[PDB]
């Protein structure tokens, strides 16, 4: 059972939301890296 | 200032009975010099017994310790929130007092015949706050559990509600109670209406809480906590109606808010009297109004 | 002790404001500081309740509780004498509030932000180009009725009946009160704390009392029950399936009675006045600050 919230900053007790407790994810760059690495894997499929 | 109040009116056994309680307190009618018999404590309200009116009357008028009893007068001093006093635990339900414990005054739920003097004068009970709130809870659940087994014998048992309701506990002091085992239905008992308020507020609390959460959650984020504490209730009380006549819903909400506030002002025990240093060898305690 | 505060006006005063203000003698006014002399700014709630169209009642309550209180008796040109109110002192408070509230005997007064319109309790002081509003004082049951009517309007904003909520009723007269549409995030924060308390109530609410009240509405009918219109609610159907046990009922009440004291004390916003000996022929009473 989770909860939903906008923002906070700079804690000391650990299980409190913050700006440093956010994973820093860029979706478009990860999709781009994922797609180009799928094509590198698909070339690696047909090598030996 | 001047603090004495001389009230006018007894005989030898009345002298001894009033002399037994020369350290107890009781309310008055007015802060004047001379008064009559009828203006003394709890006489005109307790003779049908009903708790909430008596608590309102006890918070209404002021209070007074009595000092001396003559043949035709009772010398007594009213208490003012300025300075301090010295009162006694001279009540037949003996609850042992302790140091720096806040003392309460509740209207007498322990029967008329214990805390009285038959001439009339009815003294209120004085007893500390955790014992006060615990005896309030253990008389209220006793009321509703007696009404349930008077209604349905298969929902609870009588000895099931005497293994856990006939006794209060505070710092090892395991007292007993005088519980009214035969209240009689349709009201007519003491604490008959407070349970009747408690059940209505505990019935209207789902219709209040769901309407409040659904009305507060549309204002998007002042705070996360109104939806953060949406998981801690059960989902049975979550999906209840979400639709009613808003005339009926508003009337139910207004009645539940009024009865909730009156009940919450009553669960706060009333006039809280604070001790400083109790002495059991002397049965006296420094006390002042708070 | 000498409690006199004189407020110096920065300019003169026209004769109509003199005639209006000398009618407003004896009312409770708030002050900015507690020092010797002050200017006209910082007096009254007009600094936080400006000449605008959207009020904010709870921030007005905050400004009332945070600052000190005084009473205005002597008013002339360029100068008007105030008398402070400090805990430990007693005062006389006259009843010069034009919504004429009949005061109960020895009840308790409560100050109030002006709910009956800005123009009702306001003196326009164009000479010092500012405005002084006069905070309403009215008894505590009417106070709680106005406050819960305000919050129920704030929560039933998003639903729709209007005249049956935004108009109080008294034995003396029924009145109308000014209603905003949003009280801002502080009113939403009051609703936040109220819903916090309420959702933890409906987590920890006892289940013996529901099993009482189901059979009680199906057995009895009262003014305390006819608001249900002789219909059981749905959560009474989907909650009373469980058995009835004493121990968890006591453990529920042992936290319920703790929480309801906090829920009462959250409605203690605005300074309270427990007065004594009100007379219906002098229109004043001996009061002090609780």
From Swiss-Prot, chain A:
Domain of life, per UniProt, equals: Viruses
Looking at the record, which segments are called Interaction with major capsid protein/MCP? 1-45
Q: Where in the cell is it found?
A: Virion; Host nucleus
Transmembrane ranges, per UniProt, are: none
Entry similarity comment: Belongs to the herpesviridae CVC2 protein family.
What is the protein's known function?
Capsid vertex-specific component that plays a role during viral DNA encapsidation, assuring correct genome cleavage and presumably stabilizing capsids that contain full-length viral genomes. Participates in the interaction between the capsid and the tegument through interaction with the large tegument protein/LTP.
Q: How does it assemble?
A: Heterodimerizes with CVC1. Interacts with major capsid protein/MCP and triplex capsid protein 1/TRX1 at the pentamer vertices. Interacts with the large tegument protein/LTP.
Under which name does UniProt file this protein?
Capsid vertex component 2
The beginning of the lineage is:
Viruses, Duplodnaviria, Heunggongvirae, Peploviricota, Herviviricetes
Of the parent protein, the shown chain spans 10 to 57 of 570
Curated annotation (Swiss-Prot), chain C:
Q: Name one GO cellular component term.
A: viral capsid
Question: Where is this chain's protein located in or outside the cell?
Answer: Virion; Host nucleus
* InterPro entries the UniProt entry points to: Herpes_capsid_2 (IPR002690)
GO molecular function of the protein, one example?
A: structural molecule activity
Q: Where would you say this protein principally sits, based on its record? A: virion
Give the record's keywords alphabetically. Capsid protein, Host nucleus, Virion
As for family, the record states: Belongs to the herpesviridae TRX2 protein family.
Self-association and partners:
Interacts with TRX1 and major capisd protein/MCP.
> What does it do?
Structural component of the T=16 icosahedral capsid. The capsid is composed of pentamers and hexamers of major capsid protein/MCP, which are linked together by heterotrimers called triplexes. These triplexes are formed by a single molecule of triplex protein 1/TRX1 and two copies of triplex protein 2/TRX2. Additionally, TRX1 is required for efficient transport of TRX2 to the nucleus, which is the site of capsid assembly.
What is the recorded name of this protein?
Triplex capsid protein 2
> Can you name the source organism?
Epstein-Barr virus (strain B95-8) (HHV-4)
């Amino acid at each position: 059972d989770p909860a939903r919230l906008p923002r906070d900053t700079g804690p000391e007790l650990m299980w409190a939301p913050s700006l440093r407790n956010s994973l820093r994810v860029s979706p478009e760059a990860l999709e781009l890296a994922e797609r180009e690495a799928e094509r590198a894997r698909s070339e690696r499929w047909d090598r030996c | 200032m001047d603090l004495k109040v001389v009230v006018s009116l007894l005989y030898t056994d009345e002298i001894a009975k009033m002399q037994q309680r020369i350290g107890c307190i009781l309310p008055l009618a007015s802060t004047h010099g001379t008064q009559n018999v009828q203006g003394l404590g709890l006489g005109q309200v307790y003779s049908v017994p009903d708790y909430v009116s008596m608590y309102n009357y006890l918070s209404d008028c002021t209070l007074a310790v009595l000092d001396e009893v003559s043949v035709d007068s009772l010398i007594l001093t009213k208490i003012v929130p300025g300075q301090t006093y010295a009162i006694k635990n001279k009540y037949q339900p003996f609850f042992q007092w302790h140091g720096t414990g806040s003392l309460s005054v509740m209207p007498p739920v322990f029967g008329r015949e214990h805390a009285t003097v038959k001439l009339d004068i009815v003294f209120p009970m004085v007893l500390p706050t955790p014992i006060a709130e615990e005896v309030l809870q253990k008389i209220l659940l006793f009321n509703v559990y007696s009404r349930v087994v008077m209604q349905a014998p298969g929902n609870a048992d009588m000895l099931d509600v005497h293994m856990h309701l006939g006794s209060v506990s505070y710092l090892g002091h395991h007292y007993e109670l005088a519980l009214p085992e035969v209240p009689g239905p349709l009201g007519l008992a003491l604490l008959d209406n407070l349970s009747l308020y408690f059940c209505i507020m505990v019935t209207l609390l789902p219709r209040a809480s769901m309407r409040l959460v659904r009305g507060l959650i549309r204002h998007e984020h002042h705070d996360l906590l109104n939806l953060f504490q949406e998981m801690v209730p059960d989902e049975i009380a979550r999906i209840d109606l979400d639709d009613l006549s808003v005339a009926d819903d508003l009337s139910r909400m207004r009645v539940m808010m009024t009865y909730l506030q009156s009940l919450a002002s009553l669960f706060n025990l009333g006039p809280r009297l604070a001790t400083a240093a109790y002495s059991q060898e002397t049965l006296t305690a420094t006390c002042w109004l708070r």
